Structures are given as C-alpha cells and as structure tokens.
Design a binder for this molecule. Structure first.
Ligand SMILES: Nc1ncnc2c1ncn2[C@@H]1O[C@H](CO)[C@@H](O)[C@H]1O
Lengths: 338, 288, 209, 57
C-alpha cells in the first residue's frame, strides 16, 4: 500500500492548500497601505568588539542587554560586555569549530555546539574558581547548527542529523526528540512563551513544534531553497524566515500561510541571519554581499542599509530591550549599531 | 623666471600632481581595509607617508629654492633642510621593504614569528629617526655659513647675511657628496642589488626543486625593473654633485642639473605603481 | 578596575593566537585514508596532531559527516592544503568509484571557497593496482586510452586525468605522490608540499610572484 | 515495509495537522498591525532616542 496512500497524501496536501487559499481573503499590502511609512533609518556604529582572530560564527545577547557571548573559529567563546567593551570571561573550547552559542536567560550558563556533535554547558559563577566544563550533551550524528536555552535547567538544540532535541542538563539525556524533517535543521527560534519553537530546515520547510507534546502543530512550505535562519515575531503569533534565494518571508501561525515576501531585484545573495526589533516593525536581515538590510516588516520596503563590514555577516543579535543591534561578521569585528 | 626654469617648474608641478593622489590612495586602501595590516604593508605605509611628504612639501620647497628669493642664511637653511629629511626617508623605506622581501623567502616557515608588526613598527621608527639625523646634520653646524660670512665681511657689510637663497651655495658640497652620497645613498643601492640577487637565487632554487621559465622571467623582470628604477632616479644628481666636487673646472649646463632633480623627484611618482599595485590584495581592495 | 582583567584577557588571547598561528591545518578528503592516518599518526571531526621537522600539523578528518557537504565546507576555508586521497584500485569496483572520486575532486576544485587552497593528491595502493592492471584492462573506465596494460602509463594516465580536471590555471597547484610504504617518505612529501605552498603564498603576498 | 511505514507516519501527522482550523488572514494581519501600533512607543530603532537615554552615546 504505497501508491494509493501516496495519492491520499497528495489529495490531503491539495486540500490543505485549498483551505489556506480559502482563508486567504485579501493581500496584506492592500490593508497595510493605510500605515504611515518608516522612511529612512541609518544607524551609528557605537562599538567594535575586536578580540577575535578567526571568523565569528554566532552570537547571543543576554537578558541584561549588557553581556553578549561571541563564538569564533579560533576556539574562543568570549563574554563581551557591550557597554565598556570589556571581556568578562574568555572560555577556551575543545573543538575549534563552533557554529552556535547561547546565553542562559538568568545569566548563569553558556552553551556552545560545533561540528564535534557535542553541546557544551559551561557554568559561570563557579565558586571553586574559573569557568569549567560543567556538562557535555552528546546524542547527535550531525553538526549542532543552533541551540537555545529554555531556562537554566533544560536546553533545546537543533542539529544536522534531521532531529531537534530537548535535553535536560542535570541528567544528560534527551528528554525528548523531535523528528520529521527531511534535510539539515539549520536554525530554531523560541517563542517568548517557551512552549512553542519553530525550526527551519534544508527542505524549504519551517515547522512549529510543541515542547510538551513533541509533534508538528503546523508546517510551512514556501521557499525555493534551504532556510538559513529563523526568528519569531515578538508577540508569538508569527515568524520570519530567510533563505538562500534572496527572499525573506513572514509566516503567520493563525492564518497558516505566508503574509509577505521581501525580495529585491538588486539582491541575488542569500540571507545568513534574521531578527526583529522590539516593536516588530523592523526585520533585520544579514546578507552575503557584506551588508545588512533593515526592512519595513509591514509595508515590505527596505528601511535602511548597514554596510560597516568587510566580509559577510554570520550572526545578527538584538537586545531584549531593543537598544542595540550587534552584527558579527567573518572579519572578526562585532559591530554594534544604534 | 627663465624658460628653462619655467620648464622645470612645470615638470615639478606635474610630478607633484601625479605623486600626491597615488600615495593618498595607497594610505586610503590600507586604512579602510583590515586585511592589509601585515608587516610588509606597514613598510609600504611607511614609504607612502614619506612619499606623500615628498610630493606635498619637497616639491614646493624645491620650486622655492630654484626661484631663489633673497633671504637670511639661517632661514634659507631651514627651508632647504626638509628636502634632505624626506628624500633620505624615502631611500631608507625602500631599503626596509627590500630587507623584508628578503626575509620572507630566506626563512619562510618561521617568518611570522620573526617579523611581527611590533618589530616592523620599531624598524620603521628607527629608519625615520635616522632620516631626521641625516637630514638635520647641516643645521647642527656643517654648512657654508663660514664661507658666506667671510664673503659678507669682505664686501664690508655687517649683520646676518642676506643672500639669494640657492641650494649649491648655502650647503657644502663636501657634506652632500661624502656624508650623504657615500654613507647613506650608495650602500642602500648596493645592498638592495645584493639582496635582490640573493632573492632571485632562492626563488630559482625553489622553482627548480617552460612554465617555470616564464614565472622566473617575470620575477627577474620585476626585480630588474625595481633596481633600474631606483638607480636611474637617484644616481644622476649625485654623480653631478660628485663631479662638481672633484673637478670644479668641469663645466656643466643647468638643464642637466634640472633633469637630474626632477628624476630624483620622479622616483616619488613611480614608487606606488611599482610597489603597491603589484600586490594582488591591493588591486582587489582598489577595485572594490 | 575591570580594564585590568580586560587587558589580562587580551594578553592571553594574543599569546594563544601566536601559539595557534604557527601551526599548519590540513583538510583530509577521501578509500586509503586509514593508511595515511596510521602512517603519519605520530602523536564528528577526527583531529590528529603531529610535529615534524619543527612544524606542527593538525590534520582534520571529515569522513564522519553524514550531511550535505555544502554546509560545513566553508568552515574549513583558510587551511594550507587539502590532502585528497584516491584509491587507484577503484577503477574496477563500483556508479564507478573512480568516477565518484573524480566528481568529488571536480566539486572541491571548482568550489568557490577553495580558489586559493592547494590540493595534495595521494594516489594510494600502488601494489594492488599494479597487480590488477595485468589482471584487468582499463577499457572499463576510459574509452580514450592507449597503453592498455602497463603500470607506468596506467598510473600516469590516472594522474593526468586528475590534474586535467583542474579548471583554474596557475592559481593553485596539485601535488601528486604515489603512496610509499617506506617510512618518513609520506610525511616528507607532505612537508615539502606544505613548504612549497607557504613559499608561494609569501611570494604572492609580496607581489613578487 | 520501512518506506510504507514512513509514508504512514507522514500521512497520519499530515491529517493531524490538517484537522485544525484557520483564522482569516485580514483579521490576523490587523492584529499584527495593532501590536506594532501598540508597541511603536518603546522601540528605540524605529522611534529615535537622543543621547540622554542611549547607553551607547
Ligand atoms: N646640486 C644640487 N642642486 C640643487 N638641489 C640639490 C643638489 N644636490 C642635491 N639637491 C637636493 O637634494 C635632494 C636629495 O637629497 C634633491 O631632491 C635636491 O632637492
């Protein structure tokens, strides 16, 4: 029973597409024409965090909007202090290749994952002394392309072996496993509810996962290439995805379809990272042509351009109070923008 | 004010107007970029700073000297000294670049640990302070002040001498030819020739350890162009000064001296194309 | 106050960077990889370290990656050399393993991240090849071939095909060595090829090249 | 037996995610518009703030 079951699958997918077009009343541009436009935003560079020798692969702020963790290829995980450009800690790493880093929302743990299939959990207080390897989480057969903290106790990690996972730290085991992609899972974003997390994959599909259940509530297929990075709209009802086909898309959870497409005729380069501001009005998209584009996330117009770099930007973080936007590139300079 | 001097001023202004943008462009392309902060690029920045200094200051001062407004002696010495101060720094920067280019091929495995940009900055600072010493030696007291004061007393006047400011009369030929040409211009030339022949021997050995012949011919042509450029730009004026010193009865035209001087300044225009432009990284940064 | 610890950490980063920058990083690609690893094994990613004639080498084996190559590959940009190992005896076995290896070689050669990086090509297992060339002919893989069954012309034709797959001319070099079971010869070839790459890199940096 | 099982899991999950309902797009887009207009006050990138409150001066 393969052919008739496949026909059933295709009929059900056609029915889902029909429902999505049934609930599609009108385009978002027609109703959001009545919004006052943004205009033009250029940002001043305020810092330049120069302490890395190799390419900076990923960053993540803290909830203080003061400390940020940067991870580079030369084996350094540095907790920069963005106010007075200090280095609070510099952690040496077992594997030089580190493709992600995370900072615990209370500011007590730093997690990093690379090509060694091993997430690492470094504690920061450590009344015995300096920073120490606290726990090593190893259950994947792919590169850990992104990891995030739910709290100080359990960590959700994506991977390259087609599986997201939820890990407990005090035990060291997969508390649950999220399966059901086709390609490599490039990035996951958490909702502020910490109950639902999206994840973008290499099969041109972004899937939403519930933490307690373990199942795909919703699945979005609208891209022509692989999805590099993904980030929720700040309220928890939408998320934007960036792909290598020079398009950013905004997917809505309620209407279950794509809202809008950011694609410009002068751009033929892929998106490396996306983010939103605090109000959800600016979609910040890093690119491969060495600069950042600030998009009006309602009227689909390019608000500005941030071209302070020399090589392509690999990470783009925004503080939790919306003060400053730190873009980190392969020339090892974290440019902080306001 | 004469026609020959007018031709000299026109060629000097042309050399200035060509040499200033090239050097500003080299300093620009290094500043904007972060990938061009290696030791050899610190040396090329040193040469470009000395070179824009030549193009900006020495050529107006040279035109001022050759026109020759009458002034006091010590004022004319204060005007004629930064010429030597900047040209000697140009020659020493050329020498430093050649020594670096030797070290890259002589010890290629452990080059990064030997020549760090801190040691590069120390060597550049040493070259500049020695260029200030060599330049400021006439001000320290070795000039034709004694001869001018003797002639001034002979004519009967008293006070500081008011003379038509002209470079041959104010400064002693013995300093120009013995100290400058023997001690600090000829050993850089001979040392660059020795270093570049040694670099060519090392490259020939490495390549032999028709395509190789073509690559070897290109490297040899580049080295010979550098050495010929340096020895063509500097040596005529100094040979003229030397023959003026040794045989004073040897009578030479003025236009010969003027051609020698604008070749000496022509080196300042020629240096960016020969040195910075041949690097692939610099052409990449220029085009982008 | 905090600037004291900031400058201490700056000093430690600078010292660690000076220590790390002297070492040579090599990328392995495969079939005969185990021979090379066990030969020069003196001292996810399998990382091995060995020190030969005042050089430190870190070799990285990427063979345990069951993922898309196009994703992790740009991490390894900036290595000195790519040790690419080909089994000569794979012309007969299976589509064809020799064509699979040539396709991988074409992919890494025409990969946009490795325009500068030189490939050290190891054609391994010469003995099994010299037996199997008298055993079986090369009509299987190559239609345009003349010296049907002889080790010398067979090996030279395989080498010529691989080096001919290089589309970029004079930007990078391909160094070919038939793998010797004699001690120190493989490591010696690696050292000579890395030394040549370092000298060419310095000459290109001067503009003298 | 493995391929049909993978396709079985695919179809069962696909029917499971198909069984939910979907809100019309204009209402949810107006909700996102309302959220943006609500929090348009405290966004320092959209709404510019001078060097008084800015900790990066
Ligand atoms: N005979 C000379 N007449 C005028 N200037 C001279 C003479 N010899 C050397 N110089 C000056 O010295 C500089 C080189 O040190 C020349 O660029 C030139 O300005």
């Amino acid at each position: 029973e393969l052919d008739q079951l496949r026909q059933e699958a295709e009929q059900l997918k056609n029915q889902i597409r029909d429902a999505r077009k049934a609930c599609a009343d009108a385009t978002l541009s027609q109703i959001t024409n009545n919004i006052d436009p943004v205009g033009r935003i250029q940002m001043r560079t305020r810092r330049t965090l120069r302490g890395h020798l190799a390419k900076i692969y990923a960053m993540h702020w803290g909830t203080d909007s003061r400390l940020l963790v940067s991870a580079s290829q030369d084996g350094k995980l540095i907790i920069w202090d963005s106010y007075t450009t200090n280095k609070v800690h510099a952690i040496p790493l077992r594997s030089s290749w580190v493709m992600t880093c995370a900072y615990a929302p209370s500011g007590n743990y730093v997690a990093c994952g690379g090509l060694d299939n091993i997430c690492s959990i470094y504690n920061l207080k450590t009344r015995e002394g300096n920073v120490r390897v606290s726990r090593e989480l190893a259950g994947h057969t792919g590169y850990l392309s992104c990891c995030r903290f739910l709290d100080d106790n359990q960590i959700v990690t994506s991977s390259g072996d087609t599986t997201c996972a939820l890990w407990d730290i005090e035990t060291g085991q997969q508390t649950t496993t999220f399966t059901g992609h086709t390609g490599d899972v490039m990035s996951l974003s958490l909702a502020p509810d910490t109950r639902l997390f999206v994840s973008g994959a290499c099969d041109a599909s972004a899937k939403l996962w519930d933490v307690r259940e373990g199942m795909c509530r919703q699945t979005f297929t609208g891209h022509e290439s692989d999805i590099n990075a993904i980030c929720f709209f700040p309220n928890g009802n939408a998320f934007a995805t960036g792909s290598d086909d020079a398009t950013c898309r905004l997917f809505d959870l309620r209407a279950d379809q794509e809202l809008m497409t950011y694609s410009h005729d002068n751009i033929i380069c892929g998106i490396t990272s996306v983010s939103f501001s605090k109000s959800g009005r600016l979609l910040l998209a890093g690119y491969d042509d060495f600069n950042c584009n600030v998009w009006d996330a309602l009227k689909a117009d390019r608000a500005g351009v941030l071209a302070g770099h020399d090589n392509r930007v690999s990470c783009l973080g925004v503080t939790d109070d919306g003060m400053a936007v730190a873009t980190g590139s392969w020339d090892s300079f974290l440019k902080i923008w306001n | 004010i004469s026609a020959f001097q007018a031709a000299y001023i026109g060629i000097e202004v042309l050399i200035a107007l060509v040499s200033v943008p090239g050097n500003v462009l080299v300093i620009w392309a290094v500043k904007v970029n972060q990938a061009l902060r290696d030791a050899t690029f610190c040396f090329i920045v040193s040469l470009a700073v000395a070179d824009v200094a030549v193009g900006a200051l020495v050529i107006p001062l040279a035109i001022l000297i050759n026109i020759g407004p009458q002034t006091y002696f010590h004022t004319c010495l204060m005007v004629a000294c930064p010429v030597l101060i900047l040209t000697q720094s140009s020659i020493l920067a050329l020498l430093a670049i050649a020594v670096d280019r030797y070290l890259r091929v002589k010890i290629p495995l452990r080059y990064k640990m030997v020549v760090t940009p801190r040691r590069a900055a120390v060597a550049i600072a040493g070259c500049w302070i020695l260029s200030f010493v060599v330049g400021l030696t006439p001000m320290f007291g070795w000039n034709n002040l004694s001869a001018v004061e003797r002639a001034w007393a002979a004519n009967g006047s008293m006070g500081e001498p008011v003379i038509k400011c002209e470079f041959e009369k104010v400064i002693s030929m013995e300093y120009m030819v013995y100290f400058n040409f023997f001690v600090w211009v000829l050993p850089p030339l001979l040392l660059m020739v020795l270093i570049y022949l040694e670099v060519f021997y090392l490259i020939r050995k490495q390549l032999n350890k028709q395509k190789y012949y073509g690559k070897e011919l290109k490297i040899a042509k580049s080295l010979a162009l550098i050495l010929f450029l340096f020895a063509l730009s500097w040596l005529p004026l100094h040979i003229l000064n030397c023959i003026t010193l040794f045989c004073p009865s040897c009578h030479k035209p003025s236009i010969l001296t003027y051609i020698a001087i604008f070749l000496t300044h022509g080196n300042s225009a020629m240096n960016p194309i020969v040195y910075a432009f041949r690097i692939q990284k610099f052409r990449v940064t220029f085009l982008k | 106050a905090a600037a004291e610890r900031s400058k201490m950490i700056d000093k430690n980063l600078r010292e660690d960077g000076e220590k790390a920058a002297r070492e040579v990083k090599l990328l392995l690609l495969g079939s005969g990889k185990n021979t090379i690893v066990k030969q020069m094994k003196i001292i996810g990613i399998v990382e091995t370290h060995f020190t030969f004639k005042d050089l430190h080498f870190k070799m990285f084996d990427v063979g345990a990656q069951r993922s898309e190559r196009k994703k992790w590959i740009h991490c390894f940009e900036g290595v000195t050399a790519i040790i690419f190992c080909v089994a000569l005896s794979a012309y007969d076995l299976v589509m064809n393993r020799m064509h699979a290896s040539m396709k991988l070689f074409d992919s890494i050669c025409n990969n946009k991240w490795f325009t500068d990086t030189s490939i050290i090509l190891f054609l391994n297992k010469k003995d099994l090849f010299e037996e199997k060339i008298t055993h079986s002919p090369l009509t299987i893989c190559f239609p345009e071939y003349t010296g049907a069954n002889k080790y010398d012309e067979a090996a030279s034709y395989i080498q010529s095909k691989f080096e001919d797959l290089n589309k970029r001319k004079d930007t990078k070099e391909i160094y070919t060595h038939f793998t010797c079971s004699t001690d120190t010869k493989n490591v010696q070839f690696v050292f000579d090829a890395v030394t040549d790459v370092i000298i060419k890199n310095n000459l290109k940096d001067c503009g003298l090249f | 037996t493995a391929s049909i099982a993978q396709a079985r899991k695919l179809v069962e999950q696909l029917k499971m995610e198909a069984n939910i309902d979907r809100i019309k797009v204009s209402k949810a887009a107006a909700d996102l518009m309302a959220y943006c207009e609500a929090h348009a006050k405290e966004d320092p990138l959209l709404t510019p703030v001078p060097a008084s409150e800015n900790p990066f001066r």
